[PDB]
Amino acid sequence: MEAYITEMVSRERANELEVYVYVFPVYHIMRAWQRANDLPLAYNQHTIMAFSPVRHMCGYTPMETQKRHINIDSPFERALLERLIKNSLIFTAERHLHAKRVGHALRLNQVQQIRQVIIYEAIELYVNIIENRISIGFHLTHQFEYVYTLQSMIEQGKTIRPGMRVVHSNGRQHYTYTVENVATYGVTDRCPLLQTSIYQYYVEKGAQHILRTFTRSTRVIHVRTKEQRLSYAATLLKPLCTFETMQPQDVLNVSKCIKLSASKRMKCTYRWIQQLRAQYRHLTFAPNPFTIAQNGYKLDQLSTPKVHFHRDYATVVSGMKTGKLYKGGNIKISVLFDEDFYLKHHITKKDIYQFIAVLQKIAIAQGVNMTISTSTKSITGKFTDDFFHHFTEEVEALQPIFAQTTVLAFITSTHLSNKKTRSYQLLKQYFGGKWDIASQVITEKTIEAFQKILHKHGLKNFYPNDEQHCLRVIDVLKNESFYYTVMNILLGVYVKSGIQPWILANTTHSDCFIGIDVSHENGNSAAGMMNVIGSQGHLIQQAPLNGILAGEKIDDTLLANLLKQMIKAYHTQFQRFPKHITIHRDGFWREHTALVEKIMSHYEITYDIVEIIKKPNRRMAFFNSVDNTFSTRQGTVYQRGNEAFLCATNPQQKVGMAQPIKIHQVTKTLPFSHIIEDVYNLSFLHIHAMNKMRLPATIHYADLSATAYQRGQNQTNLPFV
DNA sequence: TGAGGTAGTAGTAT
Ligand SMILES: [Mn+2]
Question: Which nucleotide is nearest to A246 (CA to C1')?
Fold first, then answer.
C-alpha cells in the first residue's frame, strides 16, 4: 500500500561516470562515427561524448581527447551527459527489445488490430540531472497505422488526391510526407530527378525484397516536403492513421481501446521498463526503483476545502442543492428564438417559454429574481431560416432590442455547426464582442431531451403562470440527470450576469493572486492576465495582453503597466494594499524578475512566483499489494525540494487515469507547502460548472479568456462560460 | 454549443 511514480534514480553519480570527450574547432562527424563504429554518442556545439572510445575516426582529427569525469558546475556538460544517457538507452532499446524511433517516442509491440487499423504501444523517455543525481522519467502512449498501401488503394478504385499525408514505414525506418501529384512516369521510365528509374536505383542500392514486389502495374507518386520533392512508388507508401482521418466507427472502437485503467497502464509501463533495464548496463538501479522513497519524494495528503453560499458547506453540490447564492440580484433576460425549431423539430415558442418559466422557478429559490424583457413582442417572428444566412446583414438593427440584457439564444445545432452559416461564432463575436452583451446558447438537443423526460412522466398541460405544475416538474427533475444540465445553464447565466455563486469558506495564506497565461498560436499571440482579488475567490479585473507575439517573453514595459494596474485595482476595491501577492504562470517563467522586484518593493509587498505545468508527462498511483491493483487519491502531493506533483481530480475507469499537475516555486518568500495548498484550493472555484475542474481558477479562466480573445469574441467580467 | 474529466487529436530517405 505504497506510492509509485514513473521515474528512476540511478545508483551512480553524475561525476562518477567515466566518459570520453572529443573537441572540434559537428552533426556529420557524429553521423559518420555512428555509421562506422556502432556506438551511442551525443553532440553539442563542438563536443562529442561517448562511453567507449571510437575506433575509426573516418578521417577526422580532434585537437584533444580526454577520458574523465564531467564538471557538474557547467550546464553544458550536464546537458551533454543527459543526451548521451538518453541516446544510449534508445540504442539499447532498438537492438535488444525490437523498438523503432517514430517521431519523438519509441514504437513497441502491436497490441490490437481493428478493421485494417493497427494499434502500437509506445514510450518516451526523459533524462535530468538533479544535484549530482541522474533521474530517468518515462511515459506510455499509443500509435496507429493502416494496413493497406496506396497501390492497394488505387487497385480498389479510390482516387489519390493532393494534400494527403502519407507515411513510409519499414523495419527501423519511418518517414512522413505529403502527396503532391500522381505521376504517369512509371517504374520502367527513368525518373527526372533520380537520373534513372526506380528499379535501377533500387538494384544499384540492392534489390533485397523490394524489387520482387515491383511490377509494371504499380504507379509513381510525387512527394512534396520542404523543397526536396521526392518521388517513388505506391507500393511503399501508406495513408496516415490519425483520429482526425479515421472513420467514425473506427474512431469509436479505437477510442474505446486506448483508454486504459490505472492498473493496465502502470503495469504495462513498468513491465517494459524492467525489460529495458535488464539489458542496459551503463547505470544500475534498485530491485524496485519505482517507489517515491527511491526517488527522494515526500508524501502529503490535502483535504477538501469548504465553500460559502450563505452558510458553510462541505461540497459545492450540496450547497447548490439546498443553499442560496453568495451574491444574488436581478437579471434581465431575452429570447432569440428561431422558427427553425418549429419548422424542423416541432418545438413551439410556448414550450420554450415554459422551459424558461421552469428556469425562473428554479432560480427564485437561490435568491435570484430574473425577469423576461418586454421587447420580445415587436419582432415576433424574425429569426427565420433565411435570417441566419444573412446574420451579419440583419444583425445591426437588433442592438437596441437586446441592450443591457442577457440573451438566451435558442439556435438549432445545424446553424451553429454548418460552415456556411457559422451561427455560434458570429453570435459570440457580435453579442459578446461588439456590444459586450452576455449570451447563453442552447441547442435543440437540450430542449428535446427535456421534452423526452417530460413525456416519460405525466406531461399534462403546462399552463402558463401555473405554480403547482412547475413545482411538480421541478420535483421530477430533482431526481433526473437533466438536473445538472439545468444547473449548468443557470450557473452560466449567473456568471455572465454578474452573480457570484460561492466563495471559499476559509481565507488562503496569500492575500492576492495574479495569473498569467500566454497561448501563442498562428501569427497572433493573445494572452489573458487575471487578478483573483480575494483570498476568498473573488475576481476584480482582466487584461487584454495581446501585444506579445511568437510566444516570447512578455515585454518589460507592458508587464510593468499590467502589474501596476492590478495593484491599483486591489487598492481601489479594498482600500488598502495587499501584504503578499502570489503569481501563477502558465508554463515556464521567462519574464524579467528585476521589474517585478522593483515594482513590488516600491509598494512594500512581498511576492512569490509559481509555475504550473499542465502536462508533466508523468503518472502517480498507489499500489495495493493485497489485490495487485493501482489506484489514485485526490489531493495527493509528492514533494522534492521546490517541485511537487498534485493529484487534483478523480475520474472513473471509463475515461482513463488522472493527470497530475506539476508545481514549481522560483522564489523563497513563503513555505512551499502553503503554495501547494493555495494552488489546490483555488481549483474549487468552478463557478460556471457543477463538476470539478483540474487547474486552479487563476489559469483555467486565464486560458479560457485567452482562447476567447484569440478567436475575436465592477461590471460583468467572466462572459466565457 | 449544459459542463467537466482523459488521451491523443497534443506537446536524408526516392
Ligand atoms: Mn458555456
Answer: B9
Taking a 5 Å cut-off on Cβ, the residues next to ion ligand 1 are A 492, 721
Query: CA–CA separation, A43 vs A417, rounded Å?
Result: 50
Determine the distance separating the centroid of ligand 1 and the alpha carbon of A516, expressed in angstroms: 22
Q: Which residue is nearest to nucleotide B4 (CA to C1')?
A: A691
The length of chain A is: 721
The nucleotide closest to A688 (CA, C1' atoms):
B3
- Number of other residues whose CB lies within 10 A of the CB of residue A37: 16
Phi, psi of A359 (to 5 degrees): -60, -45
- How far from chain centre, in Å, is Cα A73? 35
Give the Cα separation of A279 and A29 in Å (integer): 28
* DSSP SS3 for A547: coil
Q: Which nucleotides in chain B lie closer than 7 A to a protein CB?
A: 1-11, 13-14
C-alpha A649/C-alpha A631 separation (Å) is 13
At A573, list the grid cell. Answer: 476595491
Question: Are A347 and A448 spatial neighbours (Cβ–Cβ below 8 Å)?
Answer: yes
Cα(A535)–Cα(A533) distance, integer angstroms: 7
Beta bridge partners of residue A308, listed in sequence order = A312, A503
- Kindly state the cell numbers that stand for A689: 460548472
Tell me which residue has cell 479505437: A254
User: Which residues of chain A between 63 and 122 are close to nucleic strand B, CB under 7 A?
Assistant: 103-105
Interior CA angle at A52 toward A23 and A24, to 5°?
10
Q: Which residue has the cell 442577457?
A: A406
Cβ of residue A445 lies below 7 Å from strand B: yes
| Nearest C-alpha neighbor of A124 from the set A524, A664, A509, A617 | A617
From residues 593-622 of A, list those within 7 angstroms of strand B by Cβ.
Answer: 615, 617
From CA A353, how far away is CA A357, in angstroms rounded? 6
The whole-number Å distance from A685's CA to B11's C1' is: 27
- Give the method used: cryo-EM
Interstrand relation of A527-531 and A512-518 (parallel, antiparallel or unpaired): antiparallel
